[PDB]
Amino acid sequence: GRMHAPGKGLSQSALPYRRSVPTWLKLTSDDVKEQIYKLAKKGLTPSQIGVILRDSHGVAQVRFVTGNKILRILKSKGLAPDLPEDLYHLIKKAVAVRKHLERNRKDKDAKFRLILIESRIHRLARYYKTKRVLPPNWKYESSTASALV
Amino acid sequence: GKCRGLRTARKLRSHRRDQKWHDKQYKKAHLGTALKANPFGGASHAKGIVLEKVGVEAKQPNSAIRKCVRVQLIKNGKKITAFVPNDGCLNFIEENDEVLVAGFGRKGHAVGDIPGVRFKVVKVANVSLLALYKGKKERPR
Amino acid sequence: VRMNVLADALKSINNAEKRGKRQVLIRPCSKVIVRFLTVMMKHGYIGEFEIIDDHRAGKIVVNLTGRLNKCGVISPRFDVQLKDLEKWQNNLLPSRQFGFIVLTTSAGIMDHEEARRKHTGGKILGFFF
RNA sequence: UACCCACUCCCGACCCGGGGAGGUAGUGACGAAAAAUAACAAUACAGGACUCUUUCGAGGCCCUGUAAUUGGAAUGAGUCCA
RNA sequence: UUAAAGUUGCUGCAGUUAAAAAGCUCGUAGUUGGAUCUUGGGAGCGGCCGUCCCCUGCUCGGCGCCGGCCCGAAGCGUUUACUUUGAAAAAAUUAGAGUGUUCAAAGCAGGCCGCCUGGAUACCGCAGCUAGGAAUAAUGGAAUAGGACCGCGGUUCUAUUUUGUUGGUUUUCGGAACUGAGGCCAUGAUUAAGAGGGACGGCCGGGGGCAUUCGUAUUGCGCCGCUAGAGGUGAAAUUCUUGGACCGGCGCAAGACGGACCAGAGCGAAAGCAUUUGCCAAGAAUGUUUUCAUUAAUCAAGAACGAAAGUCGGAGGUUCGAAGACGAUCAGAUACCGUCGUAGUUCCGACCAUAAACGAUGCCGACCGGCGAUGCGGCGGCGUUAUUCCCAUGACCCGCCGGGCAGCUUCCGGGAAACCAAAGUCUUUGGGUUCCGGGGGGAGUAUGGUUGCAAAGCUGAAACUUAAAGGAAUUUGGCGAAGGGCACCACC
RNA sequence: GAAGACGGUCGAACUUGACUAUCUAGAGGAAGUAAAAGUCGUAACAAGGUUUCCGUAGGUGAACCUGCGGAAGGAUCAUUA
RNA sequence: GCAAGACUGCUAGCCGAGUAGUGUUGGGUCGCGAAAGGCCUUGUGGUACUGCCUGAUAGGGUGCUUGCGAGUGCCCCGGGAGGUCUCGUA
């Protein structure tokens, strides 16, 4: 099931069969790109961009109304952050666990979950080095909290 | 095998090698301690000198005494006990004679009724015990 | 985790034949399962199948007759020369009169006697009888 | 604590000399292949085979066997001119 | 020494109880890896099917030809294994054709009245070399376009067949490097796995850590009235007591633990978790038309946690209490029982890594029967209650979905049986991956190494002895077991 | 053009000294095996007469016993608002 | 604009009126609830059945017989009177 958790699970999205835009929506694709630009300028993550674009304007998927995805448009303009958002969230969770363990010493379970989070970071960093996104000399040490966010 | 990969050859070769080396019948022949423990050194027959004749005890359901001759070898001077097979053949062996000690047949195990021995006698005074038992020849003096 | 889709699918239809069902849905779809059920239908052991088309890895539903006994698999894909075909078909085929073993070649996915008559070997894929 | 360069070859001025290289023997139950110590007759004896006497009993020429019996035809080991 | 030995298991072992899952997670080498890229068209030899032709191109010269087509070829059209052919692959020995060593093991001889002759072949795993095939695992281009294609336009260095016999010229003929603008393409990204990571909203749980508060009970101190007794056993005593033991009541002080609710219930990888409230940090589950796009379970060598007791320095020392001291049961108690009683039991730290740490059953993934309850979250529907009306919320009920501890029946099927929805999909053996055992003792023992202040933890034999030690189950036996019936050789 | 000599190089070997592996005295103690008869008691197997077993501590002639924490391989698959 | 169906709230003449007053937890049009008075056509029939309280003959806490377990009956008023209700008994 899960990579670190013991139990299994089954909860994920299920995209429908039809590769067609909805007929009732007359919202122009250039306009959809314009909300993608302005909500990305507001400073959110592409999962949040997708859920708000699905929520307010009621579009099924970006990939049907347009030809690309959200991160493809963000890297086409160039205002996307260099750090990936999942690595950013995992690093922020790790430094939150480190700040929790700064004051608590006997908490062995927090140290165990810290080892698990660092294991997941080391597992994903080699893939992001392999697919040539991150520089080859990049590495996550135990002290990178003032320079890396 | 437990591992059934295409490119997992000497994993299984090493596992076979370790569990073959960790056997007993295989370990009896491939270690020098077994040959250094046997006084024969892998030899079928051996020569030795008789120094005394001893009566040994027997097992539980068959109560008797058996006749074992003590034989000293020439390879190392080790003091071992043999066993005269046939009936009425103890009197042919006295002190200071050469005998041809051999095996018995259970790879150096105490066979049947006589504890503490693993070898018997085949020849005495350069003639076989069968000849001295059946009266085929005469013992020299 | 699912790596060999073929072995799981053929064990699924093997258990479906053993239990006594008539239709069974195997989850993954590759080209190799299509070719194996194709030559399965060509050599007359099972009923005609349907492949459902989705926008993902599809599924296959098969109508089953009672003519099949065992649908095995060989993992991994050992290479088979023409001098070594008798070595496999003596100890894996239940008899010489029937029982049919398939191996993938440079020409296509096809059985052993056609490989003998066109003189081309390849790696072994599976078997049935 | 054998005989010889004749067969197969080899150095050397060289048809012609030499070679325990080799060959020929004797010892030899490492081991392998072939293959003697028996065949021929029946009274003395249990009937199986074919027909009758409910069953013993005649014909039984092929008889399954077997008792230091008989006139026997044969070949070898070994002795031994060549 | 080999087959028997399916008792070394590549084919082809076993792991709940017969020998054997490290206590449980993380994790580097190695191993194993989701789907998908090209099919058909045109006609034939024949009674619709079996043979069967095409599926990259631009210089030298050729069954031919009347400036142009085809054919032969020095020059080439990314790459591994597999598969078939080909070369090169000492002889005897292995298999094997030929012939009367009289047979045969051998040998390459031999036959017709000078001649005929054979004295071959097959095999020689791998690795190296050359070729028609792209089914199978990966390689590979073009995404900040230093992307392809016919072309347009400039800078620098050099080969001769061209410029009155000739000293001499850039050329023309043309080689290479750089290079500015535009056109042209169908201008370049397959999806979203009943794989994985992450984000979002409600929530769930004795999950953790820190700080709090509460509840009796134990023991002791201070006071009050009371009497000569609390100690314990099928049986007494050692214990304390007019120096007031014991009990009842009022207050103070310390320490331990959170009963009844408290369940074949929940959480955590495992050891383990139960008084209230507050703070911090996660995590499974359900919901998704969100995001990333093969990131994937498995783990040599390496790391964190780890019941109880064990050692080391402090604080407090109430109950309980190894050793130690007595009384009886006893023939003998140094053991059971009763009275005191040390370390320890509690926290702050510093360590070691052991259990019947046991579901005595590794982890991931799929498939194969039913049934009713239980816990989480969601999807709807009668009806009642928050008093009477209207919607959603908590609670009741009906039925569904996904995960988990589980329960009942079941020749599914398996096994030696007890039994098992896995302990099945195993001779009809093959989904992938770590660890561990070949008779029982000697023995987790000698010794070596290694961690440890200390006990010990891991690795780990040999010699010698025996033919048994062991697992499941019916019947006899005897119980200082349970439950029945019988008798005047038992009782009333 | 011999003998002989100073230098170089390869160098067998010798003396001194350390170290390493095998065999053999080895005073002495600690153990198990092969057996049929000698004393204390039967520790465990039937509620083994104190239920058994596993880790960690402690003394004893002996199997053994006692805390602390677990197990059912136990005699309980179950105790009624 | 035609055009009737399906069920339903209350009042037992209608207006005052769902008006004072009450109120839950989170709401709303909000449940519960008379009256002084007026206009007066002048105020409906069959049929049950009732321990107490909170807060309806509602819902739910809970009752009585005598030892036991369960049934019978159990609002008020007037009158006729009798004297311990059954089913089996841990």
Curated annotation (Swiss-Prot), chain A:
Record PTM N6-acetyllysine, positions in chain: 26
SUPFAM superfamilies: S15/NS1 RNA-binding domain
UniProt-listed Gene3D superfamilies: 4.10.860.130, S15/NS1, RNA-binding
Pfam family, one: Ribosomal_S13_N
GO molecular function terms noted in the UniProt entry: small ribosomal subunit rRNA binding; structural constituent of ribosome
Residues with Phosphoserine modification: 29
Location of cross-link Glycyl lysine isopeptide (Lys-Gly) (interchain with G-Cter in SUMO2): 42
UniProt xrefs under SMART domains: Ribosomal_S13_N (SM01386), Ribosomal_S15 (SM01387)
Covalent link location (Glycyl lysine isopeptide (Lys-Gly) (interchain with G-Cter in ubiquitin)): 26
Signal peptide: none
One GO location term (cellular component): cytosolic ribosome
Subcellular location: Cytoplasm; Nucleus, Nucleolus
Entry PTM: Ubiquitinated at Lys-26 by RNF14 and RNF25 in response to ribosome collisions (ribosome stalling).
N6-succinyllysine modification, residue list: 26, 33
Phosphotyrosine sites (modified residues): 37
Purpose of the protein: Component of the small ribosomal subunit. The ribosome is a large ribonucleoprotein complex responsible for the synthesis of proteins in the cell. Part of the small subunit (SSU) processome, first precursor of the small eukaryotic ribosomal subunit. During the assembly of the SSU processome in the nucleolus, many ribosome biogenesis factors, an RNA chaperone and ribosomal proteins associate with the nascent pre-rRNA and work in concert to generate RNA folding, modifications, rearrangements and cleavage as well as targeted degradation of pre-ribosomal RNA by the RNA exosome.
Quaternary structure and interacting proteins, as annotated: Component of the small ribosomal subunit. Part of the small subunit (SSU) processome, composed of more than 70 proteins and the RNA chaperone small nucleolar RNA (snoRNA) U3.
Protein known as: Small ribosomal subunit protein uS15
Organism: Oryctolagus cuniculus
From Swiss-Prot, chain B:
Localisation: Cytoplasm, Cytosol; Cytoplasm; Rough endoplasmic reticulum; Nucleus, Nucleolus
Modified residues annotated as N6-acetyllysine in this record: 134
GO (cellular component) term, any one: cytosolic ribosome
Transmembrane segments: none
SUPFAM superfamilies assigned: Nucleic acid-binding proteins
Residues with PTM N6-succinyllysine: 53
InterPro entries according to UniProt: NA-bd_OB-fold (IPR012340), Ribosomal_uS12 (IPR006032), Ribosomal_uS12_euk/arc (IPR005680)
GO MF assignments: structural constituent of ribosome
Keyword Transcription regulation: no
Listed GO biological process terms: translation
The keyword Ubl conjugation appears for this protein: yes
Biased composition (Basic residues): 1-19
Cross-link Glycyl lysine isopeptide (Lys-Gly) (interchain with G-Cter in SUMO2) residue location(s): 36
Key words, A-Z: Acetylation, Cytoplasm, Endoplasmic reticulum, Hydroxylation, Isopeptide bond, Nucleus, Ribonucleoprotein, Ribosomal protein, Ubl conjugation
Chain residue ranges for the region called Disordered: 1-25
Post-translational modification: Hydroxylation at Pro-61 affects translation termination efficiency.
Family to which the UniProt record says this protein belongs: Belongs to the universal ribosomal protein uS12 family.
Subunit structure: Component of the 40S small ribosomal subunit. Part of the small subunit (SSU) processome, composed of more than 70 proteins and the RNA chaperone small nucleolar RNA (snoRNA) U3.
Protein purpose: Component of the ribosome, a large ribonucleoprotein complex responsible for the synthesis of proteins in the cell. The small ribosomal subunit (SSU) binds messenger RNAs (mRNAs) and translates the encoded message by selecting cognate aminoacyl-transfer RNA (tRNA) molecules. The large subunit (LSU) contains the ribosomal catalytic site termed the peptidyl transferase center (PTC), which catalyzes the formation of peptide bonds, thereby polymerizing the amino acids delivered by tRNAs into a polypeptide chain.
Family matches, as NCBIfam families: PRK04211.1 (NF003254), uS12_E_A (TIGR00982)
Record protein name field: Small ribosomal subunit protein uS12
Native source species: Oryctolagus cuniculus (Rabbit)
Gene that this polypeptide is encoded by: RPS23
From Swiss-Prot, chain C:
Keyword hit for Ribonucleoprotein: yes
Molecular function terms, GO-annotated: structural constituent of ribosome
UniProt-listed GO biological process terms: translation
Pfam short name (any one): Ribosomal_S8
Disulphide bonds in the chain: none
Family under the similarity heading: Belongs to the universal ribosomal protein uS8 family.
Protein's UniProt name: Small ribosomal subunit protein uS8
Phylogenetic classification of the source organism: Eukaryota, Metazoa, Chordata, Craniata, Vertebrata
